[PDB]
């Protein structure tokens, strides 16, 4: 039979890989399109400096990474290892982002 | 007689339907939002930049939608006025 790693080993390998590096993890062009779409609803005919889009992506990725850490602690608190929607909602409530 | 009571009763209505600038039978009435004032569409489309010329309240909406209910009360009044004159 061909080789297969057990479920969970590769997940741990990826955790070590992405915590070791610093490169951005969202694809550049799809994120840029999203920023422009949101901006058109506030003011038409806007232009963006290239560094402005980069600053938005750095902040967004840092925020989501920090949020996933808090979400993981909530899952472990309930004696689970799988994060679920109710875990994110609890984290955001205690942080004060949604009262 | 001759429905003189109706004419007095009718005229009491139109004293409540006066443009705050045109001071006449207000045609295509419009309120620009943010205050109680209603005018004629002709005399406010110019003053949209400076706001309401009575309240000094700024204009809230770029377009000038015409209030259908205030439209209805005017055309009905004219038909009521014409019928009450028996023409």
């Amino acid at each position: 039979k061909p080789h297969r790693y057990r479920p969970g080993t590769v997940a741990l390998r990826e955790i070590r890989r992405y915590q070791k590096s610093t490169e951005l993890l969202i694809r550049k062009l799809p994120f840029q399109r999203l920023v422009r779409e949101i901006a058109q609803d506030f003011k038409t005919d806007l232009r963006f400096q290239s560094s402005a889009v980069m600053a938005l992506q750095e902040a967004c990725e840092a925020y989501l990474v920090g949020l996933f850490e808090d979400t993981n602690l909530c899952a472990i608190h309930a004696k689970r290892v799988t994060i679920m929607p109710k875990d994110i909602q609890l984290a955001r409530r205690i942080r004060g982002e949604r009262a | 007689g001759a429905w003189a009571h109706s004419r007095a009763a009718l005229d009491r209505l139109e004293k409540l339907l006066r443009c705050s600038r045109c001071t006449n039978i207000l045609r295509e009435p419009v309120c620009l939002g943010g205050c109680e004032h209603i005018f004629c569409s002709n005399c406010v489309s110019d003053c949209i930049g400076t706001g309401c010329p009575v309240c000094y309240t700024p204009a809230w909406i770029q377009d000038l939608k015409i209030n259908r209910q205030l439209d209805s009360m005017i055309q009905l009044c004219s038909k009521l006025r014409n019928l009450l004159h028996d023409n």
Binding site: - | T50, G51, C55, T57, P58
Partner: protein, 93 residues
Amino acid sequence: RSRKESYSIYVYKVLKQVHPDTGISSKAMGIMNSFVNDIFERIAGEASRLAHYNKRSTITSREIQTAVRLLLPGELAKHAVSEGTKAVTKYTS
């Protein structure tokens, strides 16, 4: 003695316009003083950073207007700008 400044007399005036009968307790008046002072600091402070970012040296009205758009949440913002604009237009002319 020494002389203190406060918004006591003015808060009471605004009250008697929106509720001609209800008074207001002393402790509640202290809370309103602190609230007015706090909001003044926020708006003024934000207007100062705008003037400094744009290299200006004058807190005009529009600087206050952009600060109000920043601080106050959505629906409150649309109303306070309208109220302030109305006051300036009436004051000028």
